[PDB]
C-alpha cells in the first residue's frame, strides 16, 4: 500500500505483524527441510528420538534404497507422461471452445454456455461416473486418463472470460484483412493469451502430477500406474514385504529415512521448476 | 521338452494372485521361471502390486465381470464356495480323477483334508494349500533381560506381569530409557491372544477369530462373556505401555525392528523364524538371546497354548469358467504335489537356494547362514507362496535351531497343545447365511477388537451394546446355523 | 482509388429499440465526410456497417456498381483505422503494416513500393523494424493508417482514431490526416466525437444524436446556420450561450430576457416569428462586446460580472444577467472586475433563435 | 433465416466449440444418464430409507456437516487473513521470501502431504512427539485417535492450501487504486482502520464468490484426504458421505445405495449453493 | 484556514535518479498556484511531498511557522483532491464526505453541520444518499472536493483533478473550482498538464520540467514575456511558432529569417542584440494577420499555404517559410487554398526572440 511510516500504532502493528507471518511461514518451510535433514540423516538417529531441525549421522542409504525401486521410476514415467499429454490433450479440447463460447455471435452460446457452466454445481457422482468410464472401456488405459478428463468448467469459463477481455478490434481487423476464425486465434489471441495460458497449463500441470484417487481407481497394471498411487502404497499405508522388512538389519536406513528420501526424491522436481514459474507470474511487484 | 511337462505346445495364462496384503504373483520371479521350464506353462499376473488389501483386490476382480484364467490366494475358500456355486469356478473333481493322479492320490490318503475343502453340493472348485507339521506358535522371551533385571523366567501370569512391568520400569537394555517395549508381535490379532493367559479363547483354531467346540457346542471366544474379562487386562496392559502401540500398523517390520533395536522383551510369533533371529542380529546386539518358554499359568489354573499347526488352511487357487484349459491347469496343479513340484515349491530353485542331497533337497550354505529367515527369502523368490502346493517339513527342519527343536518338543511333551477346528459341512440353503453374514460379523468384531485394545471406547460400558450389535448382524444365525451342521455330525 | 459510396436508408436494430432510423447518405468520390454526435449513437454502428463488421438489418448500402450488403469485409474493398490502434504487439511494424497483404501472394508483387510509399507519407524511415511495445501513441495510431493505406482500398474509415491521444497530439495528427487526405484523395468517411476534427477534417459535417443524422452541410453552413439548439451549442470552440427568451408586445421587432433586458431584431424575412411564443435564444461568444466600444450597436444588454478566465491574449468573460449566464470573448488586456455590473453589445446578425417546443431555428 | 445465414460463417467456431461440447455430453451428462439409473436396481426409490435408518450413514452425514463447518468457520477465512498480512510487508525481497514458502505447500501432493502427517505423528519415531517429549509432556498416538482427526486435518489444510488461495484475495486487493488509501492516509485512518474500513469491503465480492464455489460443495470437503488416513478407530468422526459413497461403491461393489446417496448429496450441495448464491446476490454485488 | 506555505531547495529522489530538482517556490496565503508542465516532472511528486504522501529526500518545506517535513498528513492541515476517483464505491455520498471525521467519529452533529454545509457548496445534496456505482464523473470529482473541504484545512491540494473527463466537462468544472476559490478563498496549490487551467485559474502558474522549475510569475508574465523558447512553446491554445532566423547585415533594426524573409525590430531598448548571431524567433498566430494592417510600414514576411483547417467563425491557417511552417489564425472565409504564395503581416510589437545555444529571451 501507500508508505507512510508515521504513527507508532501503525508502526507496532506492522512489527507484530512481519513477527507472527514470519512465525506462520517458519512453520509452512520447517516439514520440508524436517524431510531432507531425516531423509538425509541415520536411521539409528531417527529412530532415537535426534535430528529434527538438522542431520545427524549422513547415512546417505535410503536414497540408495529408493533408487534401487523400479517401479518408483516407472510411476515416474507414468506421472511424466499424464501431465505433458494430460496437459496438451487439456489445452487442445479447452483453448479453442474457450475461445468459440467467447466471441459474442453463437447461436447457442446460451445453452452451451449452460451445458459447461452446470457441470461444476451439480455433478453425476463417483460411482456412475465409474460406471461410465467401464461402458467406454477406457479402465486400466493411460489414454483413458487422458481423455478421461481433459476438461474442468473452471478453466473454460476463465479462458473464455480472458479471451473477451481482449479487444474485438484485432478479430475485427483480422476479418477486414481476410483473416476468419482459426487464422485469428492462432496469429494474434493465442500470443495475447499468453498469461492465462500459462495459468492454465499450471493447474492442468500440477492436476496431473498431484493427482491420485482417479488414476488410483481407473487402473490396475503397476506398469501403468503413477507415482501418487505407488507413494499411496509405500508412504501412508506403510504395509512391507518380509524382504524389505529383513533389508532393514542388513541396511542400517530405518523405514521412516526411506519414506523421507522418497517424498525428497517426489517434490525435488517440483521445488525446482517452482522459482522459474512463481517469478515468471510475479514480473511485477508481487502479486 | 521335459519330462514334467504337463503339455506339449507352451502355455501362457492369466493369473491374479492377490495375497496376505504383500505379495502378487511375479513371472520374473526365479520359482516360476522354474515351475515354467518345468511345467511347459507360463503364469502371467494380472494385479496391482501397489495395492494393499489383497481381500478387497479379489472383490474387484471378481465383480469387474472379466475373469482370469487361475484364480490363487489366502482366506479364499469360502469366496471359492461361493462364486464356486455361483458358476464362477469350474469344479475340478472329474478333472482331478482323470488327469490329475497325485491329488486324487492325496485326497484318498486324506479324507479329512478333502472333506473341509469340499462345497455344500461336494464338488472341489480349487486346490489348497496343505502345511506340514505339528506344532504352530509358542511364547519366545528375552534371556539376558531375565539375567541383569535379576529375576526368575516366570511360570504364571503374575510373575510375567511383574517381569514385563520391570521391563518398562526398569531399563532391561542399558540404554538408559523406558523406550523398550514388552511385549510386540508381527501378528496384530495376537494382542487378543493375550487373554489366553487369563483363560480365554481367541479363537477354535490356527485361523484367528474362529468358531470352536465347547462339551459338543458350537461357540465362539469373542462372543463369550469370559472374553470380556482379558481383554479388560489386556487394555490395561495397553494402558502401561506392556503392549506395542503401533502392534496393530507395525505388522510384518516388528521382529526386525523391536529386537533389532533390543526395545522387545516379549513375543509370541513362531519357533523357527524367531530363533533364527538369535544368530542373525547376535553381531548387532552383542548379547541377544531369545528362548522358547513353556505357557505360563493362567487364572484358570492351567497351561494354555491355543494354536496348533492345522491340516490344510483356507489357501489355495481355482479354475474360472474362462480358463478355456481346464486340462492342462488342472495337471499344472498336480504338477505341485509331485516331488519335483514340493522341492521347487518348498526348497526353491536347485542350483541357487538348493541342491539334490541323495535323493533329499538341502538348503545351500547361502540361505541357512543368511540373518533374514528362510521363509522370508522363499517369500521373495516366489516360494512357500499359498499357491496349491503340498508343503515338505524337512524345509523347516533344516534351518530350525537346536533350541528351536527343544522348544517343539518342550510343548509337545508338555502336551499344552490345543486341539485345532476342522470345521462342519453346511447344505446350500445354510451356506448363504454364514457366507453374507460371517464377513461383516468378523469385520466389526475386529474393528470393536481394535477400539478396546487401543483404549478408545471402554470394555464394560460398551459390552452390552457390542452385544447386542452382534445380535442384530445375525452372528448368532451362522452360530445356530453352525450347530445345526454340527449336530447332525457328532452326537455321541 | 477514388470511388463513390451511398448509402441508402440503412437500419440497424437490437431487441427492443433500434440505434440508428432509416440513415440516407450520398458520399461523392474523394469527398470526405465526418459523422459526429455524442458518446452514444449510431454513428460508429453506421460506419461499422459500411466495414461490414456488422449486419444490415435494413436498406441498402453500395460503394459504385458494387452492391456490399452481401458481402466478406475482405471484398468490401475498405480500410478501418480503429481506436484501439487494431496492430498486433507480438508482429513488428511492418509485419503489422503487411499483416493484410501476407494472406495472398508473396514478394512476388515486390511489396516494396507499398510499404515504401506508405512508410514516406507518414515518414517513418527508422520505424519500419520495430515493435508496437514501445512506440508513442502517435506513432501507432500512424502505422494503423500505415495499414490502412498499404491496402489502397476505394474507402478509408476512421472511428475515433485520435481519441486515445494527447491534444498537442491529437492536433498533429489532425495537419498529418488532413495533408493525407489533401495527397492520395480517395474517399473517406471519419467518425468522432471531437467538434473540432469535424469542423477542421471534413467537407462535409453530418452530426447525429441517439437516432439518425441530425443534420448535414459544411462546416461553416453548421456553425452559421444550426438546424435545432443541439447543433447550435456543439459546434465551436466555446458552447453557443442558450438562455430562454419570449415575445410579448411586438412580434418580429422586439424578444425580452430574464433581467427585464430587451432585445430588437433585424426583419430578415423568412422568418415568421410569433408574438407571445415562448423561445430559446441563443448568441455566440465571439459576436457579445462590452459596452460602449463598437456602437449602439446591434442590440444592448446589462449584466452582472461573475468570473473572468484569461486564456492568453484573449479572455474568457462569465456574465449574469437573469438566473442563466452566459459567455462572451473579450480581450485579455483589458482590466475587469467581479461583482459589479456590466453592459454587453450582441451582434444582431449572428443571433439565433429556436422554438421551445419544436427546438428547430426559427431566426 | 439467419440461422443458416451466420451459420455459415460461424462455421469453424462452431467446429472449435464442438469436441468441447461433445466432451461434456460424454464424460459428464451421460454419467447423469447413469444416475437415473442404478436409483432403481437392485426399482426402486427404497434403499434411501436404508441409507436414512441406517447407523453409519448417519454419521456419516453428521460428520460431514461437521467437517463441513469445521472447514469452512476455521479454513475459509486464512487465506483472507495470510492476503491481509501479506499485503502490509514492505521489503519486498521478504514479502517475495515469505509468498515463496507459504505458496510452496500447495505444489505439494495429497498424498505426500498425509504421509508427511503419519510420519510426523508416528509414536516414538516422529518428530512431534519427540519435541512433546523434549517440553516433558506425556506422548500421543494421533491417528488412531479419532478426536484428534478433525484438529490435524484443517492444520495440514491450512498448511498446503493457504498461501496458494491468499494469492487471489492478494491480487484483489491489489487491484484497488491507491488513492483510496491515499485520501485515507491525510485524513489519518490507522492500519487496522483501512483493512477494515476500507481493503475489506472492497474486497468483499471477491470472498463471496469464492465463498459460493467453497459452500459449492463442502460435503466433499477432504475426501482424498480422508479416504487415505482414517483409522479404523478413527472411522466413526472420520466418515464423509463421500468416504460412504466410494467405500460402499467402488470398495464394496454396491452400485445402487451409493449412487443414491450420490444424487442426494448432488442435490443438496445444489440448494445450498443455490441458496449461498442467492443470499451473495441479493445481498452482495455480483454473484453466479 | 488561510495560511501561508514555503517550499524551499526541496528534492525528491528515487533510487538515487533524482525526480526533482531544488525546487524553490514561496506561497502567499488565500493564493492560487499552479504547477503546470509535461509529463514526468516532480510537480505531481512535489504535491505529494507537500502532502506528505511522498517522503523529502532533501530541502525543506513549511506551512506558516511549522516545518511539515517530518509532520505526519493528517497533521499537516491540508487536504488533496486526487485526479481519479477517491470514493469508496461500498460507502453512499453522505458517509464518503463524512469519511475523514468517522475516524475518531467526533461528535454526530459536527459532521452532520459539516456534510451539509460541503453538500449546501457543491450541490451534493440530492446526491447525499445516492451511491458512487452510478454517479458521473463530475459529481465524484465534486463529492471528491466535497469531503476535501469538509476537512476545513489550511492547504487545498490538488492533483490533475480534471484530467479523467471530457472537455466540457473540464470547462464546467474548471469555473466552477475557479467560482469555489472566490467563495473558500484558502491556499491552493494546483497541478495540471494542461496550460488551459494553469492560465484561467493561477494567480500565479510555475512552469516545471524534468524536476526543474523553468519560470514563475502571473499567466500574463508567462504569456507576454517568457523566460525561454520551452515556456514560449508552452503557454497559449496554439504553440508559438518559433523558427530559426539569423541577422548577418543590420543589427538593432532588422532580423532575417530562413525563407530569405527579412523582418524590421522595434528598438525595444535594453536588448543590444548583435548582428550574425544565431537566433529563434517566434510570434503568436493571434498576432499574424493575412494583409491585415493595409499597407503595413515596414513590408511583413511572405511563405506559401501548406493547409487550412476551420474551426468556426475563425480559421487554422498553416503557412509554410522555407523548410519551416508557422500556425496563423484568421477570418472565417479565408478562400486560400494550398500551393499558392501568400503574403503575411507581422505585428512589430509582439515579436519574440531567444538565444540558439542559450535558451533564453535576451530579447
Ligand atoms: O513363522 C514361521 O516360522 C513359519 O511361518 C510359516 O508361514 C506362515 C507365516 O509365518 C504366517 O503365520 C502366515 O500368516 C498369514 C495368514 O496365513 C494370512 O495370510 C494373513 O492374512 C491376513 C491379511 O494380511 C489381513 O491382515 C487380514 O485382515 C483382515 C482383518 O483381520 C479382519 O478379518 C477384516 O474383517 O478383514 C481384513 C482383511 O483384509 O481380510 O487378516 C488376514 C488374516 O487371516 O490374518 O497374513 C498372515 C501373515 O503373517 O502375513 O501363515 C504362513 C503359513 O503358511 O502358515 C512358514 O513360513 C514356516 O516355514 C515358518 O516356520
Not at chain 2, 522348544?407 to 476342522?422: A, L, R, S, T
Not at chain 3, 499483416?99 to 507499398?114: E, H, P, Y
Not at chain 4, 436404508?50 to 476455521?74: D, Y
Not at chain 4, 508427511?116 to 517429549?133: D, E, H, I, K, R
Request: charged fraction near 20%; hydrophobic fraction near 45%.
Amino acid at each position: 500500500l501507500a508508505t507512510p511510516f508515521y504513527s507508532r500504532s501503525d508502526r507496532i502493528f506492522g512489527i507484530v505483524n512481519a513477527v507472527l507471518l514470519g512465525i506462520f511461514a517458519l512453520c509452512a518451510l520447517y516439514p520440508i527441510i524436517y524431510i531432507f535433514s531425516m531423509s538425509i540423516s541415520s536411521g539409528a538417529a531417527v529412530t532415537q528420538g535426534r535430528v529434527f531441525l538438522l542431520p545427524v549421522d549422513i547415512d546417505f542409504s535410503a536414497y540408495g534404497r529408493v533408487l534401487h525401486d523400479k517401479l518408483f521410476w516407472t510411476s515416474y514415467a507414468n506421472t511424466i507422461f499424464y501431465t505433458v499429454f494430460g496437459v496438451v490433450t487439456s489445452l487442445i479440447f479447452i483453448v479453442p471452445g474457450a475461445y468459440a463460447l467467447s466471441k459474442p455471435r453463437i447461436r447457442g452460446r446460451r445453452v452451451f454456455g449452460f451445458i459447461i457452466a452446470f457441470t461444476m454445481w451439480f455433478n453425476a457422482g463417483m460411482i456412475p461416473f465409474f460406471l461410465n468410464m467401464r461402458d467406454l472401456g477406457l479402465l486400466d488405459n493411460r489414454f483413458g486418463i487422458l481423455i478421461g478428463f481433459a476438461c474442468n468448467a473452471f478453466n473454460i469459463i476463465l479462458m473464455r472470460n480472458y479471451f473477451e477481455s481482449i479487444s474485438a478490434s484485432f478479430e475485427e481487423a483480422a476479418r477486414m484483412d481476410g483473416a476468419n476464425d482459426l487464422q485469428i486465434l492462432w496469429k494474434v489471441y493465442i500470443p495475447l493469451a499468453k498469461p492465462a495460458l500459462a495459468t492454465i497449463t499450471l493447474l492442468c500441470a500440477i492436476s496431473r502430477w498431484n493427482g491420485y484417487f482417479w488414476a488410483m481407481v481407473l487402473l490396475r497394471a503397476e506398469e501403468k500406474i503413477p507415482l501418487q498411487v505407488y507413494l499411496k502404497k509405500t508412504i501412508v499405508d506403510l504395509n512391507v514385504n518380509e524382504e524389505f522388512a529383513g533389508a532393514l538389519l542388513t541396511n542400517s536406513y530405518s523405514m521412516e529415512t526411506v519414506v523421507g528420501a522418497i517424498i525428497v526424491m517426489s517434490i525435488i522436481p517440483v521445488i525446482i521448476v517452482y522459482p522459474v514459474v512463481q517469478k515468471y507470474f510475479t514480473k511485477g511487484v508481487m502479486l | 521338452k521335459e519330462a514334467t511337462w504337463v503339455t506339449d505346445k507352451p502355455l501362457t495364462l492369466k493369473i491374479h494372485m492377490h495375497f496376505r496384503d504383500k505379495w502378487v504373483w511375479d513371472e520374473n520371479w526365479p520359482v516360476a521361471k522354474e515351475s515354467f521350464r518345468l511345467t511347459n506353462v507360463k503364469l502371467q499376473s494380472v494385479a496391482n502390486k501397489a495395492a494393499t488389501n489383497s481381500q478387497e483386490q479379489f472383490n474387484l476382480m471378481m465383480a469387474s465381470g472379466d475373469l482370469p484364467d487361475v484364480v490363487g490366494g489366502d482366506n479364499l475358500k469360502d469366496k471359492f464356495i461361493q462364486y464356486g456355486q455361483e458358476g464362477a469356478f469350474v469344479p475340478l473333481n472329474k478333472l482331478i480323477d482323470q488327469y490329475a493322479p497325485h491329488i486324487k492320490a492325496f485326497f484318498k490318503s486324506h479324507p479329512e483334508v478333502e472333506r473341509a475343502i469340499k462345497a455344500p453340493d461336494g464338488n472341489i472348485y480349487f486346490i489348497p494349500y496343505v502345511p506340514d507339521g505339528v506344532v504352530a506358535r509358542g511364547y519366545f522371551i528375552r534371556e539376558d533381560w531375565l539375567k541383569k533385571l535379576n529375576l526368575k523366567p516366570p511360570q504364571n501370569i503374575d510373575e510375567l506381569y511383574t517381569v514385563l512391568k520391570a521391563f518398562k520400569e526398569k531399563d532391561p537394555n542399558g540404554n538408559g530409557k523406558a523406550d523398550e517395549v514388552p511385549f510386540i508381535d508381527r501378528h496384530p490379532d495376537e494382542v487378543f491372544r493375550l487373554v489366553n493367559f487369563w483363560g480365554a479363547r481367541s479363537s477354535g483354531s490356527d485361523n484367528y477369530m474362529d468358531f470352536y467346540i465347547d462339551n459338543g457346542r458350537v461357540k465362539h471366544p469373542w462372543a463369550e462373556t469370559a472374553f470380556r474379562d482379558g481383554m479388560k487386562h489386556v487394555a490395561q496392559w495397553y494402558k502401561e505401555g506392556l503392549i506395542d502401540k503401533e502392534i496393530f500398523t507395525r505388522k510384518a517390520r516388528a521382529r526386525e525392528q523391536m529386537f533389532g533395536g533390543n526395545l522387545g522383551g516379549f513375543t509370541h510369533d513362531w519357533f523357527a523364524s524367531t530363533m533364527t533371529f538369535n544368530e542373525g542380529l547376535a553381531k548387532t546386539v552383542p548379547g541377544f538371546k531369545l528362548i522358547p518358554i513353556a505357557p505360563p499359568t493362567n487364572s484358570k489354573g492351567q497351561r494354555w497354548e491355543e494354536d496348533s499347526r492345522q491340516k490344510v488352511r483356507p489357501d489355495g487357487w481355482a479354475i474360472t469358467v474362462k480358463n478355456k484349459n481346464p486340462v492342462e491347469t488342472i495337471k499344472f496343479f498336480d504338477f505341485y504335489f509331485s516331488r519335483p513340484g514340493r522341492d521347487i515349491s518348498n526348497f526353491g530353485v536347485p542350483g541357487v537356494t538348493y541342491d539334490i542331497k541323495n535323493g533329499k533337497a538341502v538348503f545351500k550354505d547361502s540361505v541357512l547362514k543368511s540373518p533374514q529367515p528362510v521363509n522370508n527369502q522363499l517369500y521373495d523368490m516366489g516360494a512357500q507362496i499359498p499357491i496349491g502346493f503340498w508343503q515338505d517339513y524337512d524345509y523347516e527342519r533344516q534351518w530350525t535351531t537346536p533350541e528351536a527343536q527343544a522348544g517343539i518338543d518342550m510343548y509337545v511333551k508338555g502336551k499344552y497343545v490345543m486341539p485345532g477346528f476342522e470345521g462342519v459341512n453346511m447344505t446350500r440353503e445354510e451356506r448363504a447365511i454364514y457366507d453374507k453374514y460371517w464377513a461383516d460379523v468378523r469385520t466389526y468384531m475386529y474393528e470393536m477388537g481394535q477400539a478396546w485394545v487401543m483404549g478408545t471406547k471402554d470394555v464394560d460400558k460398551t459390552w452390552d451394546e457390542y452385544q447386542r450389535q452382534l445380535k442384530l448382524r445375525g452372528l448368532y444365525q451362522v452360530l445356530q446355523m453352525m450347530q445345526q451342521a454340527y449336530d447332525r455330525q457328532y452326537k455321541n | 482509388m477514388v470511388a463513390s459510396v451511398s448509402i441508402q436508408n440503412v437500419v440497424k436494430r437490437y431487441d427492443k429499440t433500434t440505434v440508428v432510423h432509416g440513415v440516407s447518405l450520398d458520399i461523392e468520390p474523394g469527398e470526405f465526410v465526418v459523422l459526429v454526435g455524442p458518446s452514444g449513437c449510431g454513428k460508429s454502428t453506421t460506419l461499422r456497417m459500411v466495414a461490414g463488421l456488422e449486419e444490415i438489418s435494413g436498406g441498402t448500402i453500395r460503394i459504385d456498381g458494387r452492391v456490399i450488403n452481401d458481402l466478406a469485409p475482405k471484398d468490401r474493398d475498405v480500410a478501418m483505422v480503429f481506436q484501439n490502434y487494431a496492430l498486433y504487439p507480438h508482429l513488428n511494424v511492418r509485419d503489422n503494416i503487411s499483416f493484410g497483404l501476407r494472406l495472398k501472394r508473396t514478394k512476388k508483387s515486390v511489396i516494396d513500393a507499398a510499404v515504401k510509399t506508405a512508410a514516406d507519407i507518414l515518414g517513418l524511415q527508422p520505424l519500419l523494424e520495430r515493435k508496437p511495445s514501445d512506440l508513442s501513441g502517435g506513432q501507432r495510431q500512424r502505422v494503423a493508417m500505415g495499414r490502412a493505406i498499404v491496402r489502397d482500398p476505394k474507402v478509408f474509415l476512421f472511428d475515433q482514431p485520435l481519441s486515445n491521444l494527447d491534444a498537442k497530439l491529437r492536433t498533429q495528427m489532425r495537419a498529418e490526416i488532413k495533408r493525407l487526405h489533401q495527397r492520395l484523395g480517395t474517399t473517406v468517411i471519419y467518425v468522432t466525437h471531437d467538434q473540432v476534427e469535424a469542423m477542421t477534417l471534413a467537407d462535409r459535417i453530418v452530426v447525429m444524436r441517439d437516432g439518425l443524422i441530425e443534420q448535414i452541410g459544411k462546416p461553416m453552413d453548421l456553425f452559421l446556420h444550426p438546424a435545432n439548439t443541439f447543433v447550435a451549442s456543439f459546434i465551436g470552440s466555446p458552447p453557443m450561450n442558450l438562455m430562454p427568451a419570449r415575445i410579448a408586445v411586438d412580434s418580429t421587432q422586439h424578444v425580452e430576457l430574464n433581467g427585464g433586458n430587451r432585445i430588437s431584431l433585424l426583419p430578415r424575412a423568412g422568418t415568421h416569428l410569433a408574438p407571445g411564443q415562448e423561445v430559446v435564444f441563443g448568441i455566440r461568444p465571439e459576436d457579445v462586446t462590452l459596452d460602449g466600444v463598437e456602437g449602439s450597436e446591434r442590440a444592448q444588454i446589462k449584466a452582472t460580472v461573475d468570473i473572468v478566465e484569461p486564456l492568453g491574449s484573449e479572455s474568457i468573460l462569465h456574465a449574469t444577467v437573469g438566473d442563466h449566464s452566459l459567455v462572451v470573448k473579450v480581450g485579455g488586456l483589458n482590466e475587469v472586475h467581479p461583482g459589479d455590473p456590466v453592459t454587453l453589445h450582441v451582434d444582431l446578425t449572428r443571433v439565433h433563435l429556436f422554438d421551445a417546443q419544436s427546438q428547430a431555428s426559427i431566426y | 433465416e439467419r440461422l443458416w445465414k451466420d451459420i455459415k460463417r460461424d462455421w469453424l467456431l462452431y467446429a472449435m466449440l464442438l469436441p468441447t461440447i461433445i466432451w461434456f455430453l460424454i464424460f459428464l451428462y451421460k454419467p447423469m444418464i447413469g444416475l437415473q439409473m442404478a436409483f432403481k436396481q437392485y426399482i426402486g426409490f427404497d434403499h434411501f430409507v436404508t441409507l436414512f435408518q441406517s447407523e453409519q450413514f448417519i454419521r456419516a452425514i453428521k460428520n460431514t456437516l461437521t467437517l463441513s463447518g469445521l472447514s469452512l468457520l476455521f479454513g475459509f477465512p486464512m487465506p483472507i487473513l495470510l492476503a491481509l498480512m501479506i499485503n502490509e510487508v514492505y521489503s519486498k525481497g521478504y514479502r517475495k521470501a515469505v509468498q515463496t514458502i507459504v505458496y510452496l505447500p500447495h505444489f505439494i501432493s495429497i498424498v505426500i502431504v498425509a504421509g508427511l502427517v503419519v510420519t510426523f505423528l508416528s509414536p516414538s519415531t516422529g518428530v512431534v512427539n519427540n519435541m512433546l517429549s523434549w517440553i516433558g509432556l506425556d506422548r500421543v498416538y494421533f491417528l488412531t485417535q479419532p478426536e484428534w482427526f478433525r484438529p490435524i486435518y484443517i492444520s495440514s489444510n491450512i498448511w498446503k492450501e493457504a498461501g496458494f488461495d491468499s494469492i487471489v484475495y492478494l491480487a484483489a486487493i491489489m487491484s484497488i487504486n491507491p488513492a483510496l488509501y491515499e485520501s485515507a492516509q491525510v485524513d489519518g485512518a490507522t492500519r487496522w482502520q483501512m483493512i477494515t474500513r476500507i481493503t475489506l469491503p472492497c474486497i468483499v465480492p471477491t470472498i463471496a464468490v469464492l465463498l459460493v464455489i467453497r459452500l459449492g460443495h463442502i460435503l466433499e470437503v477432504g475426501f482424498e484426504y480422508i479416504i487415505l488416513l482414517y483409522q479404523p478407530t478413527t472411522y466413526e468422526t472420520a466418515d464423509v458421505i463421500s468416504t460412504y459413497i466410494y467405500r460402499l461403491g467402488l470398495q464394496g461393489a454396491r452400485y445402487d445405495i451409493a449412487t443414491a446417496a450420490g444424487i442426494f448429496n448432488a442435490v443438496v450441495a445444489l440448494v445450498i449453493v443455490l441458496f449461498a448464491n442467492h443470499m451473495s446476490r441479493r445481498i452482495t454485488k455480483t454473484g453466479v
